[PDB]
Amino acid sequence: EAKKKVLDVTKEAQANLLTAKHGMTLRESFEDNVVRFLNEARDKAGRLAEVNLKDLNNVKQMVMAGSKGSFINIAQMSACVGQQSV
Amino acid sequence: MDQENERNISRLWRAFRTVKEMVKDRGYFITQEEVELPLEDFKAKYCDSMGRPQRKMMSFQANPTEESISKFPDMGSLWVEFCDEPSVGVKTMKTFVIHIQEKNFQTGIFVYQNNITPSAMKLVPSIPPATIETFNEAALVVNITHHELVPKHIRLSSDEKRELLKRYRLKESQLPRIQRADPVALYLGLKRGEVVKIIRKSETSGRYASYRICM
Amino acid sequence: TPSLTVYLEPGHAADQEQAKLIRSAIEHTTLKSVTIASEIYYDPDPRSTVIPEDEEIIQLHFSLLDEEAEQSFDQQSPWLLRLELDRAAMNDKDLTMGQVGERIKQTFKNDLFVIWSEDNDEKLIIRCRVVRPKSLDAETEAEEDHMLKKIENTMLENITLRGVENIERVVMMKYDRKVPSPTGEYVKEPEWVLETDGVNLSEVMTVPGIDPTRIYTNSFIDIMEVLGIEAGRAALYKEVYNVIASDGSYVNYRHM
Amino acid sequence: MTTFRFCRDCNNMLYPREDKENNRLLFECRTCSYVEEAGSPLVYRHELITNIGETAGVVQDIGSDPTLPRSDRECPKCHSRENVFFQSQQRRKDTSMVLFFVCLSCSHIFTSDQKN
Amino acid sequence: TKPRNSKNDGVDTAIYHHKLRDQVLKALYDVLAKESEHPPQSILHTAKAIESEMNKVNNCDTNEAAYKARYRIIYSNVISKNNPDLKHKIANGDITPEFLATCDAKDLAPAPLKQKIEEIAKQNLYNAQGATIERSVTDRFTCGKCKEKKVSYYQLQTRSADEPLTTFCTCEACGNRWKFS
């Protein structure tokens, strides 16, 4: 669904219908929309995969105790890595 | 009534109010009503039939309060005068100096509009013990002391300076220092070797008092 | 990247219109920025032209010029600064065509006279024709182009219609202050502020219509020069604390 | 739109000059005696900001570039459904993302923005 | 037959023996009567009314610059070929002389230019705004200042790769900021 949203924004911008945001170029607006959509997709998938886990999971036990890791690590090893930037 | 006329009139009124605030802050006697004079009365009094601002009638003499005399017995009367010419000539400066000298005033304030010739300012330090200080008009529109970042400063007497110096057991070259060209120093008219106290707010104790010396 | 943040007056804080008037009154406006075509054209006989668009403007002023202008008809340069002026840029800075276009420009040096139309024409066309004495030398009078290209460049670059120098941009922003409500608690209240790109604090401070007691910039040297050394100390503390705490790290107050 | 004019003798560009007794403009070559009569009072032009529509640039033999994408949109002229499409090839910062289509058969240019 | 004007209609323009007033009245009367079929007497009366209003609202001997500016504005509006209807109205009397005395330059323009003017004003007011940094919205972290869970996030590989990613959470309700690593 995130991919579909990004594709629709691309289609809208390719027909000169997209509106430039406040004090910020059209190309920057397109890039901002794409980045935000992809980041929210990764976060939501990570939270689903984290909620699935049982209480007898060792990684979840370590994360809950507070000794090693966080939900980002679980999301990347299980749900999806995400958007590489430079 | 071109817009520039009332623009200049408003800026001049602002400068007049700021100068009155400064004279009040130097320890002199100025009523609160005179500080808060509305611009309508200002236009009625200090403008001609054509609306030209008559600066020459704004010159006035101020005298210290009882409290200032008690704290500073040496303090005396002050005179302030405006100049109508865009640039101050040598003759005008000489006339102002002679007027101050014959009035036997200890200090005077000479506000000029745009520029002063070097020969005119040649005569500034030539009248001891009188002091002549100049204030460009474009720099007196807004009162500096009313900003949020400027704490409140106070001037100290000789007795208070001696008592502090003894109590902290110091020599005057170890205190923090403040320059002459510092805008607040010009505002208060601090000379060389005078100590100014600062009152400031603090996240750790609420209020805190510092001291500085004019170098 | 120097900057400067301006807070408006209490009365004008909640309304966008006075804010935009102030924003126009602060930003630096120059002629080269407001001409969609400040085209250097040949103007051999300014009495009549081939282009129909400027022909309508011709008879307007030719029936609207004083006797002195009638005498000075011959002073108008054999070249023209023909100004097709963009409507949007002119209206953005609240710039009236006549007063701003001619009052200051002719007052500065009595160098350039103009035939100008009222803003109602579909194409805002100004005819900038410089004014020179007829006593000019024969060798000088022959080299028309040589004087006028130079004076045209010095005209575009060195004439300031409105604003304050060195301030490239001014931008509107909305912030959320916290204020004691009349019942005593603290409530969130929005406000309009102006953030610039470029600092000139001595002149922005005196512009009417702003709050001259809440102005601040991230260039503590200017604050030191204008407001004092204790003000510079406070600004420097704010800068150091901001740079340290923008990473989430906490360092006790005594050290800083 | 001012155009350079070359002298017919030595190919040098013609400089303007005025004729006071007849009050007429002429173009003269500073090296020879050639003088020609000016046809318009428009000799020089200096625009500042370019209101130019974005251009697809070189089009000749663009269909043989194999790194250029494709589309199945229908030609408005020859009713063909195979074409090449690309973004504006002028590299301004603020250019919009408006496409350009070059037909495979009739080599007709059109855009995806059908503004009336 | 002939273009109606002061000389063609044989109407005297020297009534107040003022040179500037005489010539401006002659010019405005000529431009008004050139393309108008209305009888010249009421046109002359309207001209007298408008010039009297101009004189009474602003003395020429004291405000000659403003007088010239107002005359130029009105005259340019009259000559304006884009909107001929106005020369009907002033001939018809639909537009009162006081209205022309007080009206600004914009309102005398035709409807299309008016609409373009409001559109330009709206576009400029939109273009004077700053960049809005809208951050990702989420409801998991709890803020320490207002405890409103509308706290935005941003996470990246910034710390040394010997350690996992670093996240920074900023509360959009109060302005609190913190870091987790």
CATH of residue D53: 2.20.25.10
Residues D42 and D53 in one domain: no
Residues D22 and D42 in one domain: yes
Residues B135 and B191 in one domain: no
Residues D102 and D90 in one domain: yes
Domain stops at, among B127, B142, B157: B142
Rg (CA), chain C: 25
Residues D41 and D57 in one domain: no
E158 touches chain A (CB under 8 A): no
The total number of residues written for chain B in this structure: 215
Return the closest-CA partner of residue B111 out of B98, B92, B128: B92
Q: Are D and E neighbours with ≥3 CB pairs closer than 8 A?
A: no
CB of E168 closer than 8 Å to CB of E178: yes
Closest chain C residue to the Cα of E79, Cα to Cα: C60
Kind of pairing between the strands at C112-116 and C124-130:
antiparallel
Residues B53 and B100 in one domain: yes
Element (H, E) at D84: strand D83-87
* Residue A58 CA: distances (Å) to CA of A49, A55, A81, C195: 15, 8, 21, 51
Return the closest-CA partner of residue B20 out of B76, B62, B55: B62
B129 cis-preceded (ω within 30 degrees of 0): yes
Method: cryo-EM
Residues B118 and B148 in one domain: no
Residues B25 and B58 in one domain: yes
Answer yes or no: do C228 and B184 touch at CB < 8 A: yes
User: What is the C-alpha to C-alpha distance for residues A56 and A59, in angstroms, rounded to an integer?
Assistant: 9
How many domains does one find in chain B?
A: 2
Residues D51 and D41 in one domain: no
Domain at B186, CATH number: 3.90.940.20
Residues with Cβ within 8 Å of residue E156, at least 6 apart in sequence: A85, E165, E166
Residues B124 and B208 in one domain: no
Answer yes or no: do C20 and E129 touch at CB < 8 A: no
Residues B102 and B179 in one domain: no
Residues in chain E with CB shorter than 8 Å from the CB of C121 are 80, 82
Domain stops at, among B120, B142, B164: B142
Burial of E153 (C-beta count, 10 Å sphere; 0-12/13-18/19+): middle
Residues D81 and D105 in one domain: yes
Strand, helix or coil for residue C21: helix
Q: Are C and B neighbours with ≥3 CB pairs closer than 8 A?
A: yes
C169 touches chain E (CB under 8 A): no
DSSP line for B112-173: ESSEE-HHHHTTGGGSTT-EEEEEEGGGSSS-GGGSSS--EEEE--HHHHHHHHHHTT--TT
Residues D39 and D55 in one domain: no
Kind of pairing between the strands at B107-112 and B78-82:
parallel
Return the closest-CA partner of residue B198 out of B215, B170, B176: B176
CB of C63 closer than 8 Å to CB of E26: no
Side-chain-side CA neighbours of C8 within 13 Å: the count stands at: 26
Return the number of other C-beta atoms located less than 10 Å from residue C251's C-beta.
Answer: 11
Return the closest-CA partner of residue E121 out of C82, C101, A27, C24: C24
Residues in chain B with CB shorter than 8 Å from the CB of C215 are 147
Residues D98 and D51 in one domain: yes
How far is CA E95 from its chain centroid?
20
List subunits contacting chain D, requiring 3 or more Cβ pairs under 8 Å.
A, C
How many domains does one find in chain D?
A: 2
Kindly report the CA angle at C227 between C224 and C229, in degrees rounded to 5? 45
User: What is the C-alpha to C-alpha distance for residues B18 and B15, in angstroms, rounded to an integer?
Assistant: 5
Domain stops at, among B112, B142, B172: B142
- Token representation of residue C163: 């604003």
How far is CA B121 from its chain centroid?
18
Distance from CA of C118 to the nearest CA of E (A): 7
Q: What range defines the domain where residue D87 resides?
A: 47-116
User: What is the C-alpha to C-alpha distance for residues E58 and E72, in angstroms, rounded to an integer?
Assistant: 15
Residues with Cβ within 8 Å of residue A63, at least 6 apart in sequence: A69, A70, A71, A73, A74
CB of D25 closer than 8 Å to CB of C42: yes
Residues B84 and B30 in one domain: yes
Rg (CA), chain A: 18
- Token representation of residue E1: 């037959």
D39 touches chain C (CB under 8 A): no
The sign of the torsion formed by the CA atoms of A70, A73, A75, A81 equals positive
User: What is the C-alpha to C-alpha distance for residues E58 and C159, in angstroms, rounded to an integer?
Assistant: 32
Residues B118, B119, B125, B131, Cα dihedral to 10°: -80
Residues B197 and B120 in one domain: no
Residues C116, C117, C119, C124, Cα dihedral to 10°: -80
Residues D81 and D101 in one domain: yes
Burial of D10 (C-beta count, 10 Å sphere; 0-12/13-18/19+): exposed
Residues B155 and B119 in one domain: no
Residues with Cβ within 8 Å of residue C85, at least 6 apart in sequence: C34, C35, C36, C97, C124, C125, C126
Residues with Cβ within 8 Å of residue C152, at least 6 apart in sequence: C40, C79, C81
Closest chain D residue to the Cα of A26, Cα to Cα: D96
Domain stops at, among D11, D30, D46: D46
Distance from CA of C151 to the nearest CA of D (A): 15
Q: What range defines the domain where residue B189 resides?
A: 143-215
Residues B126 and B173 in one domain: no
Alpha helices in chain C (DSSP H): 16-26, 52-62, 67-72, 87-92, 97-98, 104-109, 138-142, 144-157, 201-204, 220-226, 229-245
Residue with tokens 């090839």: D89
Residue E103 is assigned to a ligand binding site = no
Residues D82 and D66 in one domain: yes
In eight-state DSSP terms, residue C102 is I
Residues B137 and B55 in one domain: yes
List subunits contacting chain C, requiring 3 or more Cβ pairs under 8 Å.
B, D, E
When CB atoms are compared, the residue of D41, D47, D49 closest to C44 is D41
Element (H, E) at B197: strand B195-202
User: What is the C-alpha to C-alpha distance for residues B212 and B178, in angstroms, rounded to an integer?
Assistant: 6
Residues with Cβ within 8 Å of residue B36, at least 6 apart in sequence: none
Domain at B19, CATH number: 3.40.1340.10
How far is CA B185 from its chain centroid?
10
Residues D41 and D67 in one domain: no
CB of D94 closer than 8 Å to CB of D84: no
Closest chain D residue to the Cα of A13, Cα to Cα: D97
Residues B51 and B65 in one domain: yes
CB of B144 closer than 8 Å to CB of C227: yes
Resolution to 1 decimal place, in Å: 3.3
Side-chain-side CA neighbours of E44 within 13 Å: the count stands at: 14
CB of E18 closer than 8 Å to CB of E59: no
Side-chain-side CA neighbours of E141 within 13 Å: the count stands at: 26
Residues D22 and D59 in one domain: no
When CB atoms are compared, the residue of C202, C206, C235 closest to B149 is C235
